[PDB]
Design a protein around this nucleic acid. Sequence first.
DNA 1: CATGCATGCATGCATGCAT
DNA 2: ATGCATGCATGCATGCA
Lengths: 632, 611
Amino acid sequence: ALPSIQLPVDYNNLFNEITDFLVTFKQKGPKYMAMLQKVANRELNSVIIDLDDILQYQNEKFLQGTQADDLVSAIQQNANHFTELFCRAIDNNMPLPTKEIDLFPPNLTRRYFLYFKPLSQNCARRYRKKAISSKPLSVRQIKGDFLGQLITVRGIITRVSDVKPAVEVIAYTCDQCGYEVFQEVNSRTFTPLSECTSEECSQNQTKGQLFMSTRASKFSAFQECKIQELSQQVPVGHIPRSLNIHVNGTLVRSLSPGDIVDVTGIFLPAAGLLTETYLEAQFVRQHKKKFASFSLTSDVEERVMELITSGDVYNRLAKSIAPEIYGNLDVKKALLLLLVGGVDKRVGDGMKIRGDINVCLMGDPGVAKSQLLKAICKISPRGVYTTGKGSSGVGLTAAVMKDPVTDEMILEGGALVLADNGICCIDEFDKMDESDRTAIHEVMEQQTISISKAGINTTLNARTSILAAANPLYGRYNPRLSPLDNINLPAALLSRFDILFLMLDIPSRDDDEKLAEHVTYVHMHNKQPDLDFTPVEPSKMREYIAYAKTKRPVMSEAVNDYVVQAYIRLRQDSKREMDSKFSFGQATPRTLLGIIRLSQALAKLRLADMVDIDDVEEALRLVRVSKESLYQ
Amino acid sequence: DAVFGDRVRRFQEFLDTFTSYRDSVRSIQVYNSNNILPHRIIISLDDLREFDRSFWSGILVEPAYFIPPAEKALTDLADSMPWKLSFKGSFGAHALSPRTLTAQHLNKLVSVEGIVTKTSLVRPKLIRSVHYAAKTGRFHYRDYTDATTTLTTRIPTPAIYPTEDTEGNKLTTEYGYSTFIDHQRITVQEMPEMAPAGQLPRSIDVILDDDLVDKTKPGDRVNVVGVFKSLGAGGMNQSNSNTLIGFKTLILGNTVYPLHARSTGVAARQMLTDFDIRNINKLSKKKDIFDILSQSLAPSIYGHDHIKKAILLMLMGGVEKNLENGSHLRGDINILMVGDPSTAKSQLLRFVLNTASLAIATTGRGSSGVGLTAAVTTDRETGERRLEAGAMVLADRGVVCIDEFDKMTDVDRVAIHEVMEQQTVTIAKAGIHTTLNARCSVIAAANPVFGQYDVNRDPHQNIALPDSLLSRFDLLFVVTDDINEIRDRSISEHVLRTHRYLPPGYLEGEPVRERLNLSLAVLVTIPFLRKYVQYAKERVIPQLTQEAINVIVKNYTDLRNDDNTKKSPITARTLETLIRLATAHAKVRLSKTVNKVDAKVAANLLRFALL
DNA sequence: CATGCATGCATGCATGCAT
DNA sequence: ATGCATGCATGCATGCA
Ligand SMILES: Nc1ncnc2c1ncn2[C@@H]1O[C@H](COP(=O)(O)OP(=O)(O)O)[C@@H](O)[C@H]1O
Ligand SMILES: Nc1ncnc2c1ncn2[C@@H]1O[C@H](COP(=O)(O)OP(=O)(O)O)[C@@H](O)[C@H]1O
Ligand SMILES: [Mg+2]
Ligand SMILES: [Mg+2]
Ligand SMILES: [Zn+2]
């Protein structure tokens, strides 16, 4: 019974190389000793191991000529066993708090969480060692052969739980004899201890009762998540699949629904021989950095300086949005101003005013409206794309649901809650039911939702910017009808937009040749024609817009006097046309607020603390050119 | 004990005689010496019949005492120069369906064809568990087994996970050094094309493991070869359990084949030999190739030479693009026909439905707009709100044939705008937000609003469709039944010629017989057309050249500024259309450059369609 | 099996256009 | 001025947990 087998591993030599690495490696003194010093001194609750460091250490030791072992390979194959080995070594080399403070299982004494960081690809190519832990895989490529290894999965998060306490080492106490018993837990359910097991109680005929002590137990933080496949990975004609993830320690709250991520972990198993699986998270990597995580590190300053000192930045950053689409310079400028936004305003009293810009594009067939909402949903770090048909109103706001992990009942949010602090690009705006658009009004104006159906009586938060696409009433434009009647949006909905462009397709033998040449060049060569313009890459553009969003310009009086005069001029000029029925509506204070917001955004893009008057001039020029196709 | 070795020897000498399978052993083995191919071989039962009848009848009738010996012989051969076996060929009366499977066939090798109705979630199974003891510093291992592992019956063993070593030293699991094997369970039913109408169908479970664990998806046509087995005890062991139950049955699959049908997900495929490739290359040299391949489409219909050219171009298709940023440029072609009654419209839709490698047919008011775009917000047994695929999702990389396209309501027509141009289906409703691929092409037929085409009125008064929709259709054709005298004499003679035809091997007056065509996936005849299309689509990708650039830019500019009247509006999309058609033509010639003739032909075709 | 929410299908009513 | 057709809005049927 229980025979024996021979393997090439050796859990003695590897532990020695572990200690050598952990107290002799340098990129200041030893690298990891300092991290342990911070842990002792109570400034760090997490220690992270970079496999690149281990690889470099063993490569250097090979250069020394002394024989060693392939530690990284051993970790990659069997990774759930090296966690405790590293914890043991870390518990035998810890220092004593240089600063001041104000048998038992070893885990009660530990206060730190060990995590492994996958092995990079560039280091692998540097030292010719093909890396298995840094190869992204789909949820459909993870099969039984991978159980027990350290791998990475690329996907999109769908559902996330709420952090909860999970007991790893229950503690008890005996009122009769005074001993302490410890029980380790590694399962979803457990049975507690009942009667004392000490020497004294054992000898005596009266055995005491034990009591759980909450304060002494080792409670950890537990969270669970679900990850799906990206549409670029699913095979032809199939449906995407899902996978589960566990998060324990100081990684909780590092995953939010809707985020495209690369997550590293250990693929571990859970009456039959069949078994459930899950990924124990060890390191997360976001594909698009959130704007509200920005810091002006030296590198990011060096990168933004080149853009600042390169002259034209407004045109450079507006020509770089969808560089395969010819023309539409003003449209791209207003869409670049969409990303930045104005400056929210609280008046200190119980009143607030939004600071985001809403934009609408109404035009004729085949003018590339959709392909610009698909590029704006990709530049933004938290973008969402939806089509008018495929929507329900509730599907945009919220509904009810129950959490499998815990027993709580939860409210699920729609696309407008996923896009919070982001752009919610709506295509086919005209074709969705008017009883479905009316839920967009409150989001557009108050940046909230109010649900008063059964079970739920509450409010949500949706700090979203809406980029809408629509078409005239009967397909193409009809010059005979009035501009207002040709479109099919009520006045109340129109007022809530700040920019409403009319992209009418009027043939002209001269300009169509340019479009034809651009498109056919885009097809013969897979890139855009111009050899003088070098568009800013999405990452460098996102980094600049993130730096710009930190400002909050104010206004002077020399600009206030201009703004008021322009508002009076526009609001007088508008009544004539509106009465004449050849118009677009009637100017309202929301027009003034939109002008102010556009000026603020143009000021921010310049990295300024004051709004110049050339910004209120650019804003007025944009709002004017918005309708300069109807006057062909 | 002695029969086993004799059977091992008899299969060894069977392999010795026929050396084909010997070849296919070095094959999956020299290549695993740097995807590792799986060690499964396929044997033809016809050869085994002509070699040794007794051994053949044993496999067919008594598999549990004949297959393991053959597997051992195969493993011995491989090692000398484990490996598992799959079977193909004739099965006689053993070839059945879920309806005709009875208790007479238990414990026999059978082949069953049907529709896959319910798949499961693949899971791993434990086959060997390793342990480490630090006190002694040694490794131990346990093994496990279950009923569905082997064909023969083995006394059950007391599966128990070891926790303590014989000396008492505590053990810890080594998850990375254990062994796991994948396992799926599926359900097969009687096909709708064969089940009697009005009667509930019959089902059978099938169990797959290892390398046969994920090869089909629900709603497909499948053929499974495996052993029909029995398990458990239907109350026999119990002193008093019941008198109304029986033994549980299932099939231990060892071969699975997907079958290609009409209006079904699976796509047809043929194996191309050296002869086929040589003939295709020889045929592509002739200058009238675009006419030979074009007059051979539906040769029982008279005329319509241009719609036939368009059909061939749609079948071949253009080349799509994916830019670095992440942009996507369409590469498909779509066709609309508007016509008078009895103009051979539905007979050309059915020809496409029958000759395309993958096509799905739909009528008008029949299927709703959520049945085409896959809005199947439903729920599964696990409880995850799931989207169920639809017609356009299932037809990814295929074709959709829409009949009575004018009867489709606007609430249904507007769901197709995204698919025809964006080639995706983004569904966002309560609790679900996802995007699926719908890279399909559409061919649709319709008739005027007045019953017949009124030439006096303007085209917009007849067609009566939005310009938004009309733009997405690459080519729109108008067909009219104009009463003539010279034309009627030709069209009557042709029709009467078709109705006087006798299949070879028939006696005049003998009725013809009809059958269902379930092929096994993986003027010129129709098979050669399919082979030509497959080769051209799979191994050709042309590239644009300056000459085509000039022709296309001239034609587009001229068309935009015109004083004529068109059946459809002209937008930027038309330019892309000219590029697609050109590429398709270059694909027909098996060329890697879109030459000038391609562009000229595209211009002529579009001009005929419009004017 | 009753309560109440979200999807999808069906019907009947009103308005506009044509004869 | 009347009738017919089309589009929209109100109702119901399903499906659910
Ligand atoms: N100005 C343009 N530059 C480049 N391509 C264009 C331009 N206008 C139209 N196109 C092409 O025409 C197509 C129009 O598709 P789409 O974005 O759906 O138009 P819309 O959404 O306005 O109906 C795109 O594939 C695009 O490549
Ligand atoms: N050009 C033609 N050549 C041969 N047969 C034709 C032709 N046009 C119509 N027919 C015959 O007339 C019948 C009309 O049926 P169908 O194709 O459904 O008409 P529709 O054009 O309304 O779809 C078919 O059975 C077909 O065989
Ligand atoms: Mg569009
Ligand atoms: Mg028909
Ligand atoms: Zn006690």
